[PDB]
Design a binder for these strands. Structure first.
Ligand SMILES: [Ca+2]
Length: 579
DNA sequence: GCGATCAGCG
DNA sequence: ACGCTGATCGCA
């Protein structure tokens, strides 16, 4: 139905200096994945190209890499990385429909060109899943069906750029797309392609050691239970704990007895089995997710893992990381933290360098709320988390353990983001009236935070959404819900999204500024990971000392707030040492 | 496939 | 009855 040239070679008119481009990669993980087809729509027509012809044509390759040839795309990072795996560079991406749709309304869950086109009443294109199918049935269709689908996706991109930019501009989000998210996309593509090298001999050794400790704990559980059972089975675990052993029931799930760690911790006074269950789950989580899981996704020839940072998924503007998730590598228990010893530089005599923001969301909050005491606290470079721990546990500063700090940190964000007296009581193991008076007290010291909580909720009711400092947006239609519970979850999102999203805006700007600076100074250091407020790099050891001044400065100057930004930084031979 | 659970970020 | 996530596993 749609007209296009099914082309056997590349011609000059496919290389105009503006086009909609589709480089189709069907597999979810696009690392080292087939490119199944190419479409180009421009002023001279609509063209389908087979990748074996276009990607071996030197003039098409030059066009891909020419930054003065502008491409409109959907999910351009996916194309850029699949092309990098083919040894081909993509430059000149000036519009990315996925990131435009994400910015306009992250709740759409826009995952293909069709879902984005629907936002503008454009429906002359099919959903990807209708063309390829799902699951075992998923397949690349016959070439004429493939070619028209790719041409219709590019025809859509061609038509939708203008209405999407128009609405971005009305939302004050046009520079957010063109100067933040699209430059970031190219940077994430370099980080993903570069990968992180893994010491598989060390991982494998930790795996055999764990499997031994697992059995020993597993046997002691069976002997404390007086029988054998599937310790991972909540049916059986619940039966053992709360029927055979008659331990008190403190919580239920939709499906039975809860055995979450906070329940198990409150049962430690009653029976010794519960802490063995705890230790068992921790060892098995390390084994399942971080030894075996990692080794599954290590590319064996290079010993690299190549994550995918999803840039159009979270409702706040954060990234997430998938397959493997390199944003939740263990750190807090020393047994788990050692897995970070298997993450190593990718070259001899290079080192890992990790820099991260100190208390970023509370500094953002002090700026946005304009709370005098909170601003004054960060002007003094106070550690609110440690001060809060001192108060909670009635200890001196030197007595504050890492445990108490991250516990006090959960109270600090709990209170600003709407924890109730009940939940704070359960989290702190204190009475519900103490919990409530503690909350009254903290708002006595930070009344400007309290006003911000009330003001932001009123502003979401009036406007229908909340924004971040760089104008990221999140609609909250449930804020006017008649249902008490639904409305409440929406109010807590109103309190939290502008703070967490602004912290996301800042580190994203930090990454763009950092890359420009590294390039300007002609350094080999390059980014490997982002972990929400943390940047991890690797670099030749000859560069460590320059990076100790460069990276913190770049991150601290990314934005200017009414309080300073603070950055800590470490480097070492493995990710474990970069602390 | 989903819900409970737990690893991380604040 | 703080918010944002992803992987694994049993299935009440
Ligand atoms: Ca931090």
């Amino acid at each position: 139905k749609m007209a296009f040239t099914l082309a056997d070679r590349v011609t000059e008119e496919m290389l105009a200096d503006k086009a909609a481009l589709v480089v189709e990669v069907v597999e979810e993980n696009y690392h080292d994945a087939p490119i199944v087809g190419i479409a180009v729509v421009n002023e001279h027509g609509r063209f389908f190209l087979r990748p074996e012809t276009a990607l071996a044509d030197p003039q098409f390759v030059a066009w891909l890499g020419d930054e003065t040839k502008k491409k409109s795309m959907f999910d351009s990072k996916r194309a850029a990385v699949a092309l990098k795996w083919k040894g081909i560079e993509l430059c000149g991406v000036s519009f990315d429909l996925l990131l435009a749709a994400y910015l306009l309304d992250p709740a759409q869950g826009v995952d293909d060109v069709a879902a984005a086109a629907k936002m503008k009443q454009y429906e002359a294109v099919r959903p990807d899943e209708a063309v390829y199918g799902k699951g075992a049935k998923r397949a690349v269709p016959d070439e004429p069906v493939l070619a028209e689908h790719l041409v219709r996706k590019a025809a859509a991109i061609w038509e939708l750029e203008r209405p999407f930019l128009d609405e971005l501009r009305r939302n004050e989000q046009d520079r957010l797309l063109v100067e933040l998210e699209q430059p970031l996309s190219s940077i994430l593509a370099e980080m993903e392609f570069a990968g992180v090298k893994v010491d598989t001999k060390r991982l494998e050794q930790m795996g055999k050691e764990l499997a031994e400790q697992l059995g020993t704990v597993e046997q002691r559980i069976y002997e404390l239970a007086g029988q054998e059972f599937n310790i991972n089975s909540p049916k059986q675990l619940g039966v053992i704990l709360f029927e055979k052993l008659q331990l008190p029931v403190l919580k239920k799930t939709k499906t039975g007895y809860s055995t979450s760690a906070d329940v198990l911790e409150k049962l430690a006074p009653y029976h010794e089995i519960v802490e063995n269950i705890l230790h068992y789950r921790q060892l098995g989580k390390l084994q399942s997710t971080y030894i075996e899981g990692l080794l599954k996704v290590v590319r064996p020839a290079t010993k690299k893992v190549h994550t995918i940072f999803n840039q159009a998924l979270t409702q706040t503007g954060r990234l997430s990381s998938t397959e493997p998730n390199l944003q939740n590598i263990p750190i807090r228990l020393e047994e788990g933290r050692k897995i970070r010893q298997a993450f190593v530089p990718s070259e001899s005599d290079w080192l890992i360098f990790a820099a991260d923001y100190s208390q970023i969301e509370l500094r953002v909050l002090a700026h946005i709320a304009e709370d005098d005491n909170l601003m004054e606290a960060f002007r003094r470079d106070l550690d609110i988390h440690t001060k809060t721990a001192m108060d909670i546990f009635q200890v001196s500063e030197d007595e504050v353990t890492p445990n108490m700090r991250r516990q006090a940190k959960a109270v600090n964000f709990g209170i600003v983001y709407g924890i109730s007296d009940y939940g704070l009581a359960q989290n702190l193991n204190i009475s519900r009236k103490e919990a409530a008076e503690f909350i009254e007290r903290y708002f006595e010291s930070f009344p400007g935070v309290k006003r911000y909580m009330e003001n932001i909720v009123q502003e979401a009711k009036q406007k229908g959404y909340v924004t971040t400092l760089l104008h990221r947006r999140r609609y909250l239609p449930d804020i006017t819900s008649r249902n008490f519970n639904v409305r409440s979850f929406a109010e807590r999102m109103a309190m939290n999204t502008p703070i967490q999203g602004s912290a996301a805006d800042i580190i994203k700007k930090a990454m763009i500024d950092l890359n420009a600076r590294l390039k300007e100074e002609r350094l080999q250091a390059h980014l490997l990971l982002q972990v929400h407020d943390e940047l991890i790099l690797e670099a030749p050891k000859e560069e460590m000392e320059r990076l100790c001044r460069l990276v913190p400065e770049v991150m601290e100057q990314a934005v200017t707030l009414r309080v300073p930004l603070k950055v800590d930084y470490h480097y070492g031979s493995t990710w474990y040492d970069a602390k």
